[PDB]
Amino acid sequence: DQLLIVVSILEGRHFPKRPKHMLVVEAKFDGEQLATDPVDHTDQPEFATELAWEIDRKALHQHRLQRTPIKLQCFALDPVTSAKETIGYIVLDLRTAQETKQAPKWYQLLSNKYTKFKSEIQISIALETD
């Protein structure tokens, strides 16, 4: 009876190949942080993960009104030291979560640490009941 905000993180492209590193996307919405598994830091990383927040019907509409974003942070993870370095960010908003036809979009990393690379991550956002 109560909803989920479902953020599907599919694939990246135009990343540098970093053989000793992994990629992790963490997402924050309304003070709850979620994360993907580490995936190989290739030029075309494959996340293939759904991040989901359960939300109240009432709480959802208050979030739509004040324009509450979902912020995705991308990290390069060193699997030896567990050290994470921020590489860039993606801002999603909840109004496109309420689109009757679902279609994945390419989102450029903002404040991209890899300055010469036009790194992009393909993401869908949707609402699901129960």
From Swiss-Prot:
It comes from Homo sapiens. It is found in: Cytoplasm, Cytoskeleton, Microtubule organizing center, Centrosome. Plays a role in the microtubule-dependent coupling of the nucleus and the centrosome. Involved in the processes that regulate centrosome-mediated interkinetic nuclear migration (INM) of neural progenitors and for proper positioning of neurons during brain development. Also implicated in the migration and selfrenewal of neural progenitors. Required for centriole duplication and maturation during mitosis and subsequent ciliogenesis. Required for the recruitment of CEP295 to the proximal end of new-born centrioles at the centriolar microtubule wall during early S phase in a PLK4-dependent manner. The gene is CEP120. Signal peptide: none annotated. This is Centrosomal protein of 120 kDa. Belongs to the CEP120 family. It is linked to Short-rib thoracic dysplasia 13 with or without polydactyly: A form of short-rib thoracic dysplasia, a group of autosomal recessive ciliopathies that are characterized by a constricted thoracic cage, short ribs, shortened tubular bones, and a 'trident' appearance of the acetabular roof. Polydactyly is variably present. Non-skeletal involvement can include cleft lip/palate as well as anomalies of major organs such as the brain, eye, heart, kidneys, liver, pancreas, intestines, and genitalia. Joubert syndrome 31: A form of Joubert syndrome, a disorder presenting with cerebellar ataxia, oculomotor apraxia, hypotonia, neonatal breathing abnormalities and psychomotor delay. Neuroradiologically, it is characterized by cerebellar vermian hypoplasia/aplasia, thickened and reoriented superior cerebellar peduncles, and an abnormally large interpeduncular fossa, giving the appearance of a molar tooth on transaxial slices (molar tooth sign). Additional variable features include retinal dystrophy, renal disease, liver fibrosis, and polydactyly. JBTS31 inheritance is autosomal recessive. Interacts with TACC2, TACC3, CCDC52, TALPID3. The lineage of its organism: Eukaryota, Metazoa, Chordata, Craniata, Vertebrata. Residues 1-107 form the C2 domain. It comes from the Eukaryota.
